[PDB]
């Protein structure tokens with residue numbers, strides 16, 4: 001009965017937006033307020049008991065904030081099947097930069113069938129433009145599968161956001 005999957009998932013976004021902390025909360029249920037800046041790429045494995053016929057493992061690639069200015073993202077993205085694209089809900093510079101990351105991603109990697117990999121937008125630090133129709137419009141226009149406000153600090157919506165992205169990866173993996 002049981003089926004096991006291993007998926008490569010990217011976590012990308014500007015310096016200091018929370019990439020590392022969202023992964024540490026989701027995988028280890030821990031949070032530190034102390035900023036330790038990531039160098040290049042860091043990794044985690046999440047093991048998700050999806051349901052009774054399904055075990056999913058995620059290989060989480062934590063891409064550091066500077067890496068879009070370097071020349072290695074094509075290597076980093078290779079064979080990814082999903083992405084979280086993370087900004088800091090308090091700092092608009094980090095929101096403007098999400099399209100730079102999103103365009104980098106869509107230039108460099110696609111699913112085996114040629115489509116864009118699903119990508120979910122995480123507005124992180126929600127604990128610190130609050131808009132229902134606007135979200136939908138933005139995601140449609142820039143090819144995001146959905147959008148969640150998150151807190152790594154208070155553990156808000158990180159689990160739901162992950163399950164949402166995994167759900168899209170599973171449909172694509174069956175298709």
Ligand SMILES: Nc1nc2c(ncn2[C@@H]2O[C@H](COP(=O)(O)OP(=O)(O)OP(=O)(O)O)[C@@H](O)[C@H]2O)c(=O)[nH]1
Nearest residue numbers: 016017018019020021033035038065125151152153
């Ligand atoms: N209040 C609050 N602070 C957060 C949250 N997520 C991250 N932080 C803080 O924001 C700072 C940056 O978090 P990191 O997870 O290191 O950021 P990063 O995106 O991994 O940064 P780079 O490694 O430089 O790419 C840290 O001090 C965190 O404690 C959150 O949900 N709420």
Ligand SMILES: [Mg+2]
Nearest residue numbers: 019020037038
């Ligand atoms: Mg980091």
